[PDB]
Assembly symmetry: C2
Homo-oligomer: 351 residues x 2
């Protein structure tokens, strides 16, 4: 019997189905709303086929694929899209906001990603203004990924943002907010009970951004991930600014907290351990930074405070293999200590 | 004074220029033939500006950018391109070979990349046949990257190749050959003094492919990189097949040799050390595989045989930090021991 699975985020809107018939395992995959492709693999026996199918399924669900009724998946449509201006379109005089405002599938999308907006060094004012002036067309969005600009297009430290508080105000249904680039960025100081997830990717996170968060009310927030970055590109050097964020009173529903990509990553470990928010968390995110053995050490010296966590993300670190072995054996929950670097030590986005 | 630099390979055709005026460092970058973008960065003094510019330049040249006269770079055009069929084009009934044969810039390109050719599980027969039947239009190419199919499109083990010997025969000026995917692949057994570089990326490299190489004459070959892959996806399990390749008589002009992405990566180290080809090599490539400390050990026990090399690539390995430190301090030349994994151990393409 065919089992259908679906994966959906800002970038992927696809399905994957598997069926075992005899000694053949039949896979069908593609973008939602299309027939997709088909792969058939023969096995020595029905037993090997079923065993193979089992591993594929387990792998897919581990990656986030959700089993879905075939009749439902069949009728599902792409509900996420990225709008970006190419260099050619710019030369042609194409206006990104016009590409967005024009799209007839715009009403059907639940998530939207804003990518490169120009090549003349302009900030994203036209985009912010355009959205604010057309709130009715964007009032329905539930997810926004603002600034999906790759390294090749322009380094993160060159992304020119604007005050996005008016844009967020025009999207009252947003529950997932992701922003990349922090130069001149702001999100205001307003209550935003609509937000469930907030992640800001930065090459150096200004204090103004943190203050906007501290000044905002996010009672229903469940995930908060902030890239610290370095002083050369925006960070002001004072790590104590993040401390007030570690408060259950401030984020009573927070499950995932992350202060990442910092030179002083070990300090973040201390913040977690001494915070009153830690008991409620499921995930401690201390990735992308210069997390050393003295940082991991703290965790091991306080297993009591963290043994309830479901995941500790330390992806990209400077741990020694001996420490990683210890962490592996001494910590009961899932942890990611991958991408260890060779122990000047720099943050992940500094590469 | 503005200094202009250019980088060109199968995927990138771009320029980068830098100029220091006062305390400002002015960078201009983009695709060859376009005005590109401009970034200006102010510094505290002319000294800091020049120092900053120096680091940017050093970084660019280290990445392969070649300083070029401004008047020359200004007139340079993109000379590499990738032709690929999207799912939409297929639905529209578009034929990839027609997209290629149609392009009016085809005569001006020096390098060509063949990407996805269909979505019905077809092999690349139309492409091979199409080229063979239009040798005059492709007789000028100097570089060919056949099979640039990403993981998301379809896994490497699902790429369906064909006998490409006729395609290579239709491109007598080719000097750089790169092929990804090896199912039913062949390149024939003919003399090909035109080839300078040959790299085959595979999830399991069949003996038929190696035999084609052994059966061919490549006197002017300077680089040979072969991905071994695993038995589950094509490799036949016998590593001794590669041994005859390690011969100065066979490849008298070889400078870079690589047998990579193998489960028995340590054995490859032995092949190098015992070969008569090693003395002439500049680069020993033993990356992407399960290279362990006992493998690196051999190198350290025989510094005499390798101290002449300019580079030993061990990117993606299973070395311990202690061994990497030793290698770092005991080996006089540049080495890449990055992307170490945590010591079932698998090959890079097995992920």
């Amino acid at each position: 019997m065919k089992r259908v699975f679906v994966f959906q985020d800002f970038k992927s809107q696809k399905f994957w189905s598997i069926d075992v018939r005899g000694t053949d395992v039949i896979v069908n995959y593609g973008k939602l709303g299309t027939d997709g492709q088909t792969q058939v693999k023969n096995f020595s026996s029905a037993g090997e086929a079923e065993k193979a199918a089992g591993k594929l399924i387990a792998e897919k669900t581990k990656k986030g694929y959700v089993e879905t009724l075939e009749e439902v998946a069949k009728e599902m449509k792409v509900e996420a899209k990225k709008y970006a201006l190419s260099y050619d379109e710019a030369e042609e005089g194409v206006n990104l906001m016009d590409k967005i405002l024009k799209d007839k599938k715009l009403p059907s999308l639940k998530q939207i990603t804003i990518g490169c907006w120009g090549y003349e060094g302009e900030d994203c004012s036209d985009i912010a203004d355009g959205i604010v002036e057309n709130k009715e067309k964007f009032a329905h969005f539930e997810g926004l990924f603002w600034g999906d600009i790759d390294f090749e297009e322009q380094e993160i430290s060159w992304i020119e943002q604007v005050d996005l508080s008016p844009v967020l105000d025009a999207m009252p249904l947003l529950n997932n907010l992701k922003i990349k680039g922090t130069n001149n960025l702001s999100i205001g100081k307003k209550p935003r009970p609509n937000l469930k997830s907030l992640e800001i990717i930065s090459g150096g996170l200004p204090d103004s951004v943190v203050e906007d968060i501290l000044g905002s009310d996010l009672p229903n927030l469940e995930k908060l991930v902030l890239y610290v970055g370095v002083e050369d590109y925006g960070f002001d050097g004072d790590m104590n600014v993040f401390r007030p964020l570690f408060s259950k009173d401030r984020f009573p529903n927070l499950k995932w907290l992350g202060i990442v990509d910092a030179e002083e990553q070990n300090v973040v470990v201390e913040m977690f351990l001494e915070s009153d928010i830690l008991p409620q968390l499921e995930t401690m995110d201390i990735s992308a930074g210069v997390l050393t053995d003295e940082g991991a050490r703290l965790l091991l010296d306080h297993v009591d405070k963290i043994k309830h966590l479901k995941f500790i993300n330390m992806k990209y670190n400077y741990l020694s293999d001996e420490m990683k072995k210890e962490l592996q054996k001494s910590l009961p929950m899932k942890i990611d200590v991958s991408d260890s670097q060779e122990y000047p030590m720099i943050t992940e986005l500094e590469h």
